[PDB]
Design a protein around this ligand. Sequence first.
Ligand SMILES: CC(C)(COP(=O)(O)OP(=O)(O)OC[C@H]1O[C@@H](n2cnc3c(N)ncnc32)[C@H](O)[C@@H]1OP(=O)(O)O)[C@@H](O)C(=O)NCCC(=O)NCCS
Ligand SMILES: CC(C)(COP(=O)(O)OP(=O)(O)OC[C@H]1O[C@@H](n2cnc3c(N)ncnc32)[C@H](O)[C@@H]1OP(=O)(O)O)[C@@H](O)C(=O)NCCC(=O)NCCS
Ligand SMILES: CC(C)(COP(=O)(O)OP(=O)(O)OC[C@H]1O[C@@H](n2cnc3c(N)ncnc32)[C@H](O)[C@@H]1OP(=O)(O)O)[C@@H](O)C(=O)NCCC(=O)NCCS
Lengths: 332, 332
Amino acid sequence: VTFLEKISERAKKLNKTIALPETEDIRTLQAAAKILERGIADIVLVGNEADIKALAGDLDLSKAKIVDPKTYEKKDEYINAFYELRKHKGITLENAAEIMSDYVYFAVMMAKLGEVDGVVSGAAHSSSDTLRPAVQIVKTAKGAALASAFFIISVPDCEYGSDGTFLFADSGMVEMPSVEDVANIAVISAKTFELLVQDVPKVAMLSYSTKGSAKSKLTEATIASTKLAQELAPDIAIDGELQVDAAIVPKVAASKAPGSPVAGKANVFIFPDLNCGNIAYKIAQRLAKAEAYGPITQGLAKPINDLSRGCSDEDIVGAVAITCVQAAAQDK
Amino acid sequence: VTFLEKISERAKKLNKTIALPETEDIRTLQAAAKILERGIADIVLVGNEADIKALAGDLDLSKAKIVDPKTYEKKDEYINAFYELRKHKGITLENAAEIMSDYVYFAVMMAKLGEVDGVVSGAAHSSSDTLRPAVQIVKTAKGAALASAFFIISVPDCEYGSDGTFLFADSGMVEMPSVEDVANIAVISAKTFELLVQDVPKVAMLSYSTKGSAKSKLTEATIASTKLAQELAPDIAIDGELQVDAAIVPKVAASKAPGSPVAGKANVFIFPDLNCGNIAYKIAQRLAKAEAYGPITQGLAKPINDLSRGCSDEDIVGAVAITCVQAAAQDK
Ligand SMILES: CC(C)(COP(=O)(O)OP(=O)(O)OC[C@H]1O[C@@H](n2cnc3c(N)ncnc32)[C@H](O)[C@@H]1OP(=O)(O)O)[C@@H](O)C(=O)NCCC(=O)NCCS
Ligand SMILES: CC(C)(COP(=O)(O)OP(=O)(O)OC[C@H]1O[C@@H](n2cnc3c(N)ncnc32)[C@H](O)[C@@H]1OP(=O)(O)O)[C@@H](O)C(=O)NCCC(=O)NCCS
Ligand SMILES: CC(C)(COP(=O)(O)OP(=O)(O)OC[C@H]1O[C@@H](n2cnc3c(N)ncnc32)[C@H](O)[C@@H]1OP(=O)(O)O)[C@@H](O)C(=O)NCCC(=O)NCCS
């Protein structure tokens, strides 16, 4: 069974509201009219009234909720709260009226205030433009130094990871993580694995080196980050530096890194930077026939996800479903 | 057919001589006889005629020529040769004579001075010990900044590349190649692919970014190496900064990099550093169930190859056949 089928089913059990801002694109409506249709969640649409019922065509959205930045009965405290976290960044009140009238923003500040549980977009903008709303308004969770991105990778005939399932991170967002930032990526991705795959994360800090099989600036960066992460999170089994083969293969691990809590069992792969992360994941997907999921964001304070530039609405129902389960990571 | 068999045949039609210095290892001798029996190459065994004779017992090594570094006709000219090379890097004439009694130093000089077409060692020495004389004696071909290590990769049920075969560089040796280094690795890799795989090289300078989809020091690096490589070798197909998906999958190349010489059909992967290179090759081998060949070295003035220390006498046969075809790039 599919990770996304598993997830979307778990996501139906919950009750969560997802504010989709891309209300001028007709995919973000094909998506919208299947959320309410399967019980995946409830879902806000952020944008002009003239768009909705006229654009998509004939699809039932009475189950949906329309809120325009210039219609809602609370729109005033949005130009105000935005101006409270841009309180240090040069933008006045009518500039806080220029930025906010955009749909992405209103969908994001609704999350910050708990009017909405989460946000999915990226499909019609990019991964530069999308994450600003996610950073400036939402900010991050407490046990989190940054917003990062990741991918769930399912490898077909595979006796590695968690039944062929892995989290790769960061493979989306963070171009050049510093050693501090890497260590945190490990910790935060462990909690995401647990949440989404529902298995014990064994986190591998990757490298061409394995426990000093080589030595350079590169290795030492990872070395350090392993050991930073091992402190941040003692309860989480975390090791580095590991090559991939030692990371996943008992026989190999047994000789390259004897008595490791991770080597030979890995299911979370952590990369030195985004050349590595993004190469690794595409290589899995295309040469290993792995199914890939993401980019999904993590370490955020309330879930807000990005989308591959070009995609279908069936992917979006996927993303919306993850934004739900994610949305059930703190409320307890 | 498998890559290795293609290679062995070509080897047999060629007329190359390979030196084997690891003559106190019984796998080298076993490999030797197999290679002669089959017609894969001529052999110079470098070592002690009494010891080989005493070690070989039931092996038909009579087609081989045995050369003893301490009694060979040309000994004293090999020593001068080494002296000239290292004069200015501390070595004294005395020091030369002692270094040059090393079977493996001798065999590399043989190749340098034209008595052998290449050398295979590594079965009973570390890679550093094998690669030091290579890079000191035979040095590099015509000023490529450097020698590098590559893999030939065969993915099983793959449409991508050249029948799911690829060349990965550098995935085993140069750790932090400079921007120039990466440029050089691309050019040399393209010639190697053409030679060994026998198909038009189409080289992907890899990244997490496709056509300036993201900007950073990493991306700037890749672009600069892309741009220098095109200057270094204009008639070879080399492209921008490319993601793996944009590089091998024509439908994604149809989106992210239209009209590229490389994108959609890449078959040569150049990585930014050895984290990427190794992690990528290991994902391919382990999760993709790719067959992977060597680290094989390139960019030297004559082929020199290092084996794994747990190789079989048959792995040696194959390393010897790669090395002969590598030696076909020379000639006259
Ligand atoms: C424009 C960009 C290249 C410059 O990076 P930046 O200066 O850090 O981010 P921006 O200028 O867009 O926005 C400002 C905020 O974004 C934040 N942001 C970027 N990366 C972050 C991270 N992973 N964790 C938390 N916040 C982050 C910065 O911390 C900054 O906050 P500050 O000004 O109060 O200190 C880039 O952030 C972008 O296009 N955003 C997409 C996300 C991304 O890829 N960022 C990595 C760039 S180094
Ligand atoms: C040992 C090492 C860390 C030190 O670097 P170095 O002193 O510059 O090189 P080494 O001591 O290993 O060997 C001597 C030569 O290697 C050369 N060299 C290093 N990398 C090379 C490369 N990949 N291709 C060709 N020559 C290379 C140096 O120019 C040096 O020449 P010199 O003695 O005439 O000045 C490193 O070169 C090394 O690991 N070399 C062995 C093979 C290897 O693993 N190379 C990876 C390079 S990052
Ligand atoms: C040997 C093997 C099983 C595992 O090796 P590994 O420890 O994971 O190391 P990598 O494959 O990532 O390659 C880097 C290693 O190659 C060595 N190496 C570096 N430069 C090299 C070069 N230019 N040529 C040959 N070896 C080199 C390095 O020393 C390094 O570690 P080492 O000290 O253990 O040798 C691996 O190479 C492999 O998967 N090959 C399978 C069999 C094969 O391809 N045939 C080889 C013929 S002997």
